[PDB]
Amino acid sequence: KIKDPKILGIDPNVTQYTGYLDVEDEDKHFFFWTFESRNDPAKDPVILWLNGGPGCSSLTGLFFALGPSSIGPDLKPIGNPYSWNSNATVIFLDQPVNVGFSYSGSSGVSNTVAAGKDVYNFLELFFDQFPEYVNKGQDFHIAGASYAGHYIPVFASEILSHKDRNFNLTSVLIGNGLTDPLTQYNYYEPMACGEGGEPSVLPSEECSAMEDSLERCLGLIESCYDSQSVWSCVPATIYCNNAQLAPYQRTGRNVYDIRKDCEGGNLCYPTLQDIDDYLNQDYVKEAVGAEVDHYESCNFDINRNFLFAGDWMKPYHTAVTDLLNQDLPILVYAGDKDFICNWLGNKAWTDVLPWKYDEEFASQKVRNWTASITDEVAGEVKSYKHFTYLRVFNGGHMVPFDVPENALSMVNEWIHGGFSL
C-alpha cells in the first residue's frame, strides 16, 4: 500500500512517490522510493538504481551518492546540488527480498538468476501502476554498482526475455562493478602495488604473495565458470578473496578508496552510520509507510547465502555478449580510486569481452573525455557503437559521491547525449 514521501523532508517541488509492490503468491513485498525528474517528467527517462552487497539497501545510494538528499548528524535531510534526477525520474528498489526495507516470511533469493526473477515481477507491477512512465515513450534504463555488476546483466536478460513485456529497456549503467571475476581478479595486485594511479600500498613481499596465490585462484575461477557448481565456486571465492582481498585489508586502507583510509571494523565511511539512523527514526519510517520493524543496511544472511551458493564466482559476464549482441547500448564506468572494483580490472574485462564489434572495440583508441558541466577532463574514453568504457578520474567506490559534478555530467550526457561518450 503506497504512501507519499510528500509528507517527508526530502525533494520538494518534484513529486515523489514511495511504498510497496506486493507479490501475493510468492508473498514477496518489494519496497521502492521514487522521484519525478526535476525537469519534465514526461520527456525525461526513467532509471532503476541498484546497489550491491549482496544484500545491501538501495536507499544507501540515495542518501549518499546520487540522490536528492543526504543525511548529517542532525539526521536532517540535505539538498543535492548534483542529484541524478536533475534530469530524469528515478527508482530506488530494495532488492533483494529482506533487504533494507523489503521483506517476506519465507523465501529464497540465495542467488542471482532468481533475484532478476523477482525484479521483473516488480518492474512489470510498478509500470502498471505508474503507466505515466511509459506511453509518453520514456527511455528506461537500469543502473548500479559493484555486485550489481552480477545482477545487472542477468536482470537485463531476464527482462528482455519477455516479449510479453509491459515496458522497454533502453540501456544499462554499471559502475565500480564485479562482473567478470575471472578476468578482473588479476587486477588486484597491480592495482594495489603502484600501478593504477595511487601508489603501492603494499610491501613487495605482500605483492609477490599475491602473484603466487594467483595461478591457483584463477583455475578455481575457471572451474567454477565451466561447471557452475557449488563445489568449485564456493572455494574459489574464499580462496581468492583470501589471497587477494585480504592483504590490502590488512593495511586498513578503505577498500573503496585507496587514498583515504579506514582501519579494521569501524567505518570506511562513517556518515553511513548516520544514514541507518534517519531510516529507523519514527517519523522517517512512518511517511514511507514501510511495513518493517528494523532497518538494517545489509542483511548478513542473504550475503552468506549468496556466498554459500557459488554466486560471486559465476560467469555473468556471458550475458553482456548477448546484450551487446542484441544491440543494447552499455556503459561500464569506474572511479579510478577504488580497490574493490578497480578501473584496471573493469577496463580489461571490457577490453576482452566478446560480442560482434569485438575486433573493432579492441581497435578503438582511448580518449580524454571532458565533462559536460565543469568543462574539465574528467576521465578516460574507449567508445564503440553502443559499448563504452569510461575510466572516471578522481573516482572512488561510488563515483557520484566523490565527484558529483562529473557523475551527472557522465550521467546525463549518456542518459541524453545518444549512448556515446
Short mmCIF file of C-alpha atoms in Angstrom, two decimals:
data_model
loop_
_atom_site.label_atom_id
_atom_site.label_comp_id
_atom_site.label_asym_id
_atom_site.label_seq_id
_atom_site.Cartn_x
_atom_site.Cartn_y
_atom_site.Cartn_z
CA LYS A 1 0.00 0.00 0.00
CA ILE A 2 1.69 3.13 -1.10
CA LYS A 3 2.26 6.46 0.75
CA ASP A 4 3.99 9.68 -0.27
CA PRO A 5 7.33 10.84 0.92
CA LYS A 6 5.43 14.06 0.07
CA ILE A 7 4.95 14.43 3.86
CA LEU A 8 8.85 13.82 4.31
CA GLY A 9 11.74 16.23 4.20
CA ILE A 10 13.42 15.03 1.00
CA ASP A 11 12.88 16.58 -2.54
CA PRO A 12 10.08 19.19 -2.66
CA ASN A 13 8.84 20.98 -5.86
CA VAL A 14 9.16 17.50 -7.52
CA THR A 15 6.51 14.85 -6.72
CA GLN A 16 7.91 11.82 -5.04
CA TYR A 17 6.02 8.52 -4.52
CA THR A 18 7.11 5.60 -2.26
CA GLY A 19 5.96 2.42 -0.59
CA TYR A 20 5.46 -1.25 -1.73
CA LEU A 21 4.61 -3.56 -4.55
CA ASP A 22 3.03 -6.75 -3.48
CA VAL A 23 3.58 -10.25 -4.96
CA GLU A 24 0.80 -12.22 -3.45
CA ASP A 25 1.78 -15.78 -4.31
CA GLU A 26 5.34 -15.59 -3.55
CA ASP A 27 4.44 -13.36 -0.58
CA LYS A 28 7.22 -11.06 -1.65
CA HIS A 29 6.99 -7.32 -0.55
CA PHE A 30 9.13 -5.10 -2.68
CA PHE A 31 9.90 -1.62 -1.48
CA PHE A 32 10.79 1.48 -3.62
CA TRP A 33 11.14 5.17 -3.21
CA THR A 34 10.70 7.19 -6.42
CA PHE A 35 11.15 10.68 -7.67
CA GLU A 36 9.92 12.60 -10.79
CA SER A 37 12.53 14.18 -12.93
CA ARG A 38 13.38 17.65 -11.73
CA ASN A 39 12.81 18.85 -15.23
CA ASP A 40 9.95 17.33 -17.15
CA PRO A 41 8.78 14.01 -16.03
CA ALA A 42 7.10 13.45 -19.37
CA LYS A 43 10.11 13.54 -21.65
CA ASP A 44 12.91 12.66 -19.11
CA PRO A 45 13.72 8.95 -19.00
CA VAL A 46 13.37 6.60 -16.07
CA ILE A 47 16.09 4.91 -14.05
CA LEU A 48 16.33 1.72 -11.80
CA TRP A 49 19.05 2.19 -9.41
CA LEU A 50 20.75 -0.71 -7.98
CA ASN A 51 23.07 -1.04 -5.01
CA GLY A 52 25.26 -4.22 -4.32
CA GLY A 53 26.38 -6.48 -1.40
CA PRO A 54 24.94 -8.76 -1.99
CA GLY A 55 22.12 -7.93 0.32
CA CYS A 56 22.52 -4.06 0.79
CA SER A 57 19.66 -1.44 0.77
CA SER A 58 19.38 0.96 -2.30
CA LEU A 59 18.36 3.91 -0.15
CA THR A 60 22.03 3.83 0.52
CA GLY A 61 22.96 5.29 -2.75
CA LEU A 62 20.00 7.62 -2.44
CA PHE A 63 21.09 9.35 0.65
CA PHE A 64 24.70 9.15 -0.08
CA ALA A 65 25.97 9.23 -3.61
CA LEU A 66 23.36 10.18 -6.10
CA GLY A 67 20.02 11.16 -4.60
CA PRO A 68 18.23 14.39 -3.85
CA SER A 69 19.14 14.39 -0.21
CA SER A 70 21.80 13.23 2.23
CA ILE A 71 22.00 12.82 5.99
CA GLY A 72 24.09 14.74 8.52
CA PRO A 73 24.40 14.35 12.38
CA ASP A 74 21.37 16.42 12.54
CA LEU A 75 19.59 13.49 10.91
CA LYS A 76 18.08 16.17 8.75
CA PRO A 77 17.89 15.88 5.05
CA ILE A 78 20.18 17.92 2.74
CA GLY A 79 19.75 19.05 -0.89
CA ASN A 80 21.99 17.61 -3.53
CA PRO A 81 23.49 20.31 -5.71
CA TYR A 82 24.10 17.44 -8.23
CA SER A 83 21.27 14.75 -7.89
CA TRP A 84 20.72 12.03 -10.55
CA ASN A 85 17.14 13.04 -11.14
CA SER A 86 18.25 16.56 -12.05
CA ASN A 87 17.01 15.37 -15.44
CA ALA A 88 15.07 12.08 -15.08
CA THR A 89 12.62 10.30 -12.80
CA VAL A 90 14.44 7.74 -10.58
CA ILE A 91 13.51 4.49 -8.82
CA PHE A 92 15.18 3.12 -5.69
CA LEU A 93 14.29 -0.53 -5.19
CA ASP A 94 15.19 -2.59 -2.11
CA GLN A 95 16.25 -5.92 -3.58
CA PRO A 96 16.54 -8.37 -2.84
CA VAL A 97 13.83 -9.61 -0.57
CA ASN A 98 14.64 -8.75 3.11
CA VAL A 99 16.95 -6.13 2.12
CA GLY A 100 16.76 -2.67 3.70
CA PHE A 101 13.01 -2.14 3.60
CA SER A 102 11.58 -5.07 1.68
CA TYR A 103 10.61 -8.43 3.05
CA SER A 104 8.91 -11.75 3.06
CA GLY A 105 8.03 -14.52 5.61
CA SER A 106 9.69 -17.29 3.82
CA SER A 107 11.61 -17.26 0.75
CA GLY A 108 14.84 -17.61 -1.02
CA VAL A 109 16.94 -15.39 -3.12
CA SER A 110 20.05 -17.38 -2.27
CA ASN A 111 21.34 -16.40 -5.75
CA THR A 112 21.24 -14.03 -8.81
CA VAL A 113 19.33 -15.80 -11.51
CA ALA A 114 16.49 -15.66 -9.26
CA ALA A 115 16.77 -12.16 -7.90
CA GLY A 116 16.22 -10.98 -11.51
CA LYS A 117 13.09 -13.05 -11.47
CA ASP A 118 11.69 -11.07 -8.74
CA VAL A 119 12.74 -7.98 -10.25
CA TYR A 120 10.99 -8.35 -13.44
CA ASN A 121 7.89 -9.04 -11.47
CA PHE A 122 8.11 -5.96 -9.71
CA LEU A 123 9.00 -3.70 -12.72
CA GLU A 124 6.14 -5.13 -14.53
CA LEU A 125 3.81 -4.23 -11.48
CA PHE A 126 5.20 -0.77 -10.99
CA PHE A 127 5.00 0.03 -14.66
CA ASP A 128 1.36 -0.76 -14.47
CA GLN A 129 0.51 1.45 -11.52
CA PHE A 130 2.58 4.33 -12.84
CA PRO A 131 1.97 3.88 -16.55
CA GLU A 132 2.89 7.52 -16.65
CA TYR A 133 6.34 6.37 -17.17
CA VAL A 134 5.81 4.74 -20.37
CA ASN A 135 3.22 5.66 -23.09
CA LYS A 136 4.90 9.06 -23.45
CA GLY A 137 7.80 6.95 -24.79
CA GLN A 138 10.15 7.29 -21.85
CA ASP A 139 13.55 5.80 -22.12
CA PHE A 140 14.03 3.27 -19.32
CA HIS A 141 17.49 2.36 -18.02
CA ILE A 142 18.82 0.41 -15.02
CA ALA A 143 21.94 1.10 -13.17
CA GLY A 144 24.12 0.09 -10.30
CA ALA A 145 27.41 -0.69 -8.87
CA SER A 146 29.70 -3.42 -7.51
CA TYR A 147 27.71 -6.59 -7.09
CA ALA A 148 25.01 -5.08 -9.18
CA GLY A 149 27.56 -5.84 -11.84
CA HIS A 150 26.34 -9.54 -11.49
CA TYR A 151 22.65 -8.54 -11.13
CA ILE A 152 22.53 -6.13 -13.86
CA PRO A 153 23.31 -8.34 -16.81
CA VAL A 154 21.36 -11.15 -15.52
CA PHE A 155 18.35 -8.91 -14.60
CA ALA A 156 18.50 -7.39 -18.09
CA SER A 157 18.42 -10.71 -19.89
CA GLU A 158 15.53 -11.51 -17.89
CA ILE A 159 13.64 -8.51 -18.83
CA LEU A 160 14.48 -8.79 -22.47
CA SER A 161 13.08 -12.23 -22.06
CA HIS A 162 9.63 -11.37 -22.12
CA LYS A 163 8.14 -10.30 -25.37
CA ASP A 164 5.09 -10.36 -23.04
CA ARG A 165 6.65 -7.19 -21.63
CA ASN A 166 4.67 -4.31 -20.20
CA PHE A 167 7.69 -1.90 -20.80
CA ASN A 168 11.01 -1.29 -22.73
CA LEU A 169 14.70 -1.10 -21.51
CA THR A 170 16.94 1.25 -23.35
CA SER A 171 20.36 0.73 -21.74
CA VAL A 172 22.36 -0.01 -18.61
CA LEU A 173 24.86 1.50 -16.41
CA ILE A 174 27.27 -0.43 -14.25
CA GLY A 175 29.77 1.41 -12.04
CA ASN A 176 32.62 0.05 -9.83
CA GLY A 177 31.11 -3.48 -10.51
CA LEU A 178 32.12 -7.03 -10.21
CA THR A 179 31.31 -8.76 -13.49
CA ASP A 180 33.91 -10.95 -14.92
CA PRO A 181 35.77 -12.23 -11.82
CA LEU A 182 37.97 -14.46 -13.78
CA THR A 183 39.44 -11.61 -15.63
CA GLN A 184 39.01 -8.78 -13.10
CA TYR A 185 40.70 -10.85 -10.47
CA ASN A 186 44.30 -10.30 -11.51
CA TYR A 187 43.82 -6.66 -11.40
CA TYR A 188 44.16 -6.89 -7.72
CA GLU A 189 47.86 -6.89 -7.18
CA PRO A 190 48.63 -4.31 -9.89
CA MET A 191 46.12 -2.03 -8.59
CA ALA A 192 47.42 -2.29 -5.03
CA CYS A 193 51.14 -2.32 -5.96
CA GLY A 194 51.63 1.07 -7.56
CA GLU A 195 50.32 0.56 -11.00
CA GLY A 196 46.86 2.21 -11.20
CA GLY A 197 47.13 5.89 -10.15
CA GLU A 198 47.87 5.98 -6.42
CA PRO A 199 50.96 4.35 -5.31
CA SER A 200 51.95 0.92 -4.00
CA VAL A 201 50.28 0.36 -0.76
CA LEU A 202 51.79 -2.96 -0.01
CA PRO A 203 55.44 -4.07 0.65
CA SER A 204 56.98 -6.00 -2.13
CA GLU A 205 56.62 -9.08 -0.16
CA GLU A 206 52.96 -8.88 0.11
CA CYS A 207 52.90 -8.12 -3.59
CA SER A 208 54.77 -11.29 -4.58
CA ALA A 209 52.39 -13.10 -2.29
CA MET A 210 49.55 -12.08 -4.47
CA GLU A 211 51.35 -13.38 -7.57
CA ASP A 212 51.97 -16.81 -6.15
CA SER A 213 48.48 -17.12 -4.97
CA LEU A 214 47.09 -16.07 -8.34
CA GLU A 215 47.51 -19.06 -10.61
CA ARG A 216 45.77 -21.29 -8.03
CA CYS A 217 42.95 -18.76 -7.67
CA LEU A 218 42.27 -18.28 -11.19
CA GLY A 219 41.85 -22.01 -12.04
CA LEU A 220 39.37 -22.12 -9.24
CA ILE A 221 37.50 -19.34 -11.06
CA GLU A 222 37.78 -21.34 -14.32
CA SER A 223 36.32 -24.39 -12.72
CA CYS A 224 33.53 -22.52 -11.41
CA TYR A 225 32.80 -20.88 -14.76
CA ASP A 226 32.78 -24.10 -16.56
CA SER A 227 30.93 -26.14 -14.04
CA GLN A 228 28.92 -23.61 -12.25
CA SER A 229 28.99 -25.92 -9.27
CA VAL A 230 28.82 -25.33 -5.54
CA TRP A 231 31.89 -27.47 -5.18
CA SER A 232 34.24 -25.18 -7.08
CA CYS A 233 32.54 -22.00 -6.88
CA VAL A 234 32.47 -21.68 -3.21
CA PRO A 235 36.04 -22.49 -2.52
CA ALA A 236 37.03 -20.29 -5.48
CA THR A 237 35.53 -17.48 -3.67
CA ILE A 238 37.05 -17.88 -0.31
CA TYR A 239 40.47 -18.84 -1.65
CA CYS A 240 40.58 -15.82 -3.94
CA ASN A 241 39.07 -13.17 -1.67
CA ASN A 242 41.69 -14.51 0.54
CA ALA A 243 44.92 -14.41 -1.32
CA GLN A 244 43.72 -11.24 -2.84
CA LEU A 245 41.36 -9.16 -0.86
CA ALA A 246 42.85 -9.65 2.45
CA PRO A 247 46.33 -8.14 2.38
CA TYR A 248 45.09 -4.80 1.33
CA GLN A 249 42.64 -5.15 4.15
CA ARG A 250 45.41 -5.72 6.49
CA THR A 251 46.76 -2.20 5.71
CA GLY A 252 43.47 -0.96 6.63
CA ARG A 253 43.09 1.48 3.72
CA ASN A 254 39.50 2.00 2.71
CA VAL A 255 38.72 -0.87 0.12
CA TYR A 256 36.57 1.74 -1.67
CA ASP A 257 39.36 4.38 -1.98
CA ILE A 258 42.91 3.56 -1.69
CA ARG A 259 43.55 7.42 -0.96
CA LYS A 260 41.56 7.59 2.22
CA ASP A 261 41.93 5.15 4.99
CA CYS A 262 39.56 3.03 7.02
CA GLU A 263 41.30 0.63 9.60
CA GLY A 264 39.70 -2.71 10.65
CA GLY A 265 35.99 -2.68 11.99
CA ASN A 266 34.57 0.87 12.18
CA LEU A 267 33.53 2.80 9.19
CA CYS A 268 35.29 3.22 5.97
CA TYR A 269 32.70 5.95 5.62
CA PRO A 270 31.06 6.92 8.87
CA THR A 271 28.25 9.21 7.60
CA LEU A 272 26.53 5.95 6.58
CA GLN A 273 26.02 5.17 10.16
CA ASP A 274 24.05 8.37 10.25
CA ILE A 275 22.02 7.11 7.33
CA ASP A 276 20.97 3.83 9.02
CA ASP A 277 19.91 6.36 11.62
CA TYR A 278 17.48 8.72 9.76
CA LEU A 279 15.68 5.49 8.36
CA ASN A 280 14.88 3.91 11.67
CA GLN A 281 13.66 7.14 13.26
CA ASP A 282 9.95 7.13 13.93
CA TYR A 283 8.82 9.94 11.68
CA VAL A 284 11.06 8.80 8.78
CA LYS A 285 9.98 5.19 9.00
CA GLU A 286 6.26 6.44 9.01
CA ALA A 287 5.84 8.54 5.92
CA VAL A 288 7.20 5.80 3.80
CA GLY A 289 4.70 3.55 5.40
CA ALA A 290 7.12 0.74 5.39
CA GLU A 291 5.77 -2.47 6.96
CA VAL A 292 9.12 -3.46 8.59
CA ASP A 293 10.27 -3.02 12.22
CA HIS A 294 14.04 -2.55 11.93
CA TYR A 295 16.05 -1.15 9.08
CA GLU A 296 19.46 -2.56 8.52
CA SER A 297 21.69 -1.63 5.70
CA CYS A 298 22.89 -5.15 4.62
CA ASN A 299 21.34 -8.39 5.69
CA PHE A 300 24.20 -10.83 6.83
CA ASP A 301 22.20 -13.84 5.86
CA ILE A 302 21.45 -13.07 2.33
CA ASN A 303 25.18 -12.30 1.89
CA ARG A 304 26.02 -15.59 3.49
CA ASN A 305 23.69 -17.45 1.28
CA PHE A 306 24.94 -15.85 -1.78
CA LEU A 307 28.45 -16.80 -0.83
CA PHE A 308 27.21 -20.21 0.15
CA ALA A 309 25.60 -20.75 -3.20
CA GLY A 310 28.55 -20.22 -5.55
CA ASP A 311 27.33 -16.76 -6.62
CA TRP A 312 30.14 -14.37 -6.51
CA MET A 313 32.10 -16.51 -8.83
CA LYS A 314 29.64 -17.44 -11.71
CA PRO A 315 30.24 -16.03 -15.26
CA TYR A 316 27.60 -13.41 -15.52
CA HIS A 317 29.82 -11.55 -17.90
CA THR A 318 28.38 -14.02 -20.51
CA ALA A 319 25.05 -12.13 -20.65
CA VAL A 320 26.87 -8.90 -21.65
CA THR A 321 27.75 -10.55 -25.04
CA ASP A 322 24.08 -11.35 -25.71
CA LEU A 323 23.11 -7.96 -24.70
CA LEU A 324 25.83 -6.33 -26.83
CA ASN A 325 24.77 -8.76 -29.40
CA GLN A 326 21.20 -7.67 -29.14
CA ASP A 327 22.04 -4.01 -29.78
CA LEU A 328 21.74 -2.83 -26.19
CA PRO A 329 23.99 0.15 -25.65
CA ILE A 330 26.08 -0.33 -22.46
CA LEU A 331 28.09 1.77 -20.00
CA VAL A 332 30.74 0.45 -17.77
CA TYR A 333 32.41 3.27 -15.87
CA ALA A 334 34.72 3.10 -12.86
CA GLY A 335 36.14 5.72 -10.29
CA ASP A 336 39.83 5.02 -10.68
CA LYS A 337 40.32 5.30 -6.81
CA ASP A 338 38.56 2.24 -5.74
CA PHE A 339 40.35 -1.04 -5.00
CA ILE A 340 37.32 -3.44 -4.63
CA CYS A 341 36.25 -2.91 -8.27
CA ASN A 342 39.34 -1.25 -9.95
CA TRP A 343 39.02 0.51 -13.24
CA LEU A 344 42.10 -1.55 -14.02
CA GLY A 345 40.12 -4.57 -13.69
CA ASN A 346 36.96 -3.27 -15.24
CA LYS A 347 38.75 -1.95 -18.31
CA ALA A 348 40.27 -5.17 -19.28
CA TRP A 349 37.29 -7.30 -18.90
CA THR A 350 35.50 -4.98 -21.20
CA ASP A 351 38.63 -4.88 -23.37
CA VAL A 352 38.22 -8.63 -23.98
CA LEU A 353 34.65 -9.36 -23.68
CA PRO A 354 33.15 -10.97 -26.74
CA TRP A 355 30.40 -9.56 -28.97
CA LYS A 356 30.16 -8.66 -32.84
CA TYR A 357 32.29 -5.49 -32.62
CA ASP A 358 34.96 -7.43 -30.72
CA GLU A 359 37.95 -6.65 -33.12
CA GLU A 360 36.65 -3.12 -33.54
CA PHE A 361 36.35 -2.24 -29.74
CA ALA A 362 39.88 -3.65 -29.26
CA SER A 363 40.90 -1.42 -32.07
CA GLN A 364 39.30 1.80 -30.69
CA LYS A 365 41.51 4.39 -29.00
CA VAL A 366 41.50 5.78 -25.60
CA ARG A 367 40.45 9.32 -25.35
CA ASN A 368 40.45 12.00 -22.75
CA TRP A 369 36.79 12.96 -22.02
CA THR A 370 35.62 16.36 -20.78
CA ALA A 371 32.83 16.84 -18.55
CA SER A 372 29.76 18.38 -19.83
CA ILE A 373 29.36 20.63 -16.88
CA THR A 374 32.63 21.53 -15.34
CA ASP A 375 34.47 21.64 -18.63
CA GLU A 376 37.47 19.76 -17.29
CA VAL A 377 38.92 16.42 -18.38
CA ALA A 378 37.08 14.11 -16.20
CA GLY A 379 38.05 10.59 -17.15
CA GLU A 380 39.13 8.34 -19.99
CA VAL A 381 37.27 7.01 -23.05
CA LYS A 382 37.00 3.74 -25.17
CA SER A 383 33.90 4.01 -27.28
CA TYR A 384 32.40 1.66 -29.88
CA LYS A 385 28.92 1.70 -31.08
CA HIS A 386 26.80 1.07 -28.05
CA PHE A 387 29.64 -0.25 -25.87
CA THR A 388 31.74 2.11 -23.87
CA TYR A 389 34.26 2.00 -21.17
CA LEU A 390 34.84 5.20 -19.15
CA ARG A 391 37.75 5.50 -16.56
CA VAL A 392 36.42 8.22 -14.29
CA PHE A 393 39.25 10.40 -12.92
CA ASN A 394 39.18 11.04 -9.16
CA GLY A 395 36.52 8.32 -8.77
CA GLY A 396 36.26 6.07 -5.71
CA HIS A 397 33.78 3.21 -4.98
CA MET A 398 30.83 5.49 -5.51
CA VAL A 399 31.72 7.81 -8.19
CA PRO A 400 28.71 10.02 -7.57
CA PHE A 401 29.85 10.72 -4.13
CA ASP A 402 33.37 11.67 -4.60
CA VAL A 403 32.79 13.80 -7.81
CA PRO A 404 29.11 14.54 -8.19
CA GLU A 405 29.53 17.17 -10.82
CA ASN A 406 31.27 14.81 -13.08
CA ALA A 407 28.88 11.88 -12.40
CA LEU A 408 25.83 13.79 -13.51
CA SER A 409 27.94 15.03 -16.24
CA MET A 410 28.71 11.39 -17.31
CA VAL A 411 25.26 10.51 -16.45
CA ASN A 412 23.16 12.97 -18.25
CA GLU A 413 25.22 13.17 -21.37
CA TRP A 414 24.84 9.35 -21.62
CA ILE A 415 21.23 9.34 -20.48
CA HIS A 416 20.73 12.24 -23.03
CA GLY A 417 23.78 12.55 -25.48
CA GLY A 418 22.92 9.47 -27.51
CA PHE A 419 24.59 6.49 -25.67
CA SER A 420 28.01 7.66 -26.55
CA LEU A 421 30.79 9.40 -24.71
#
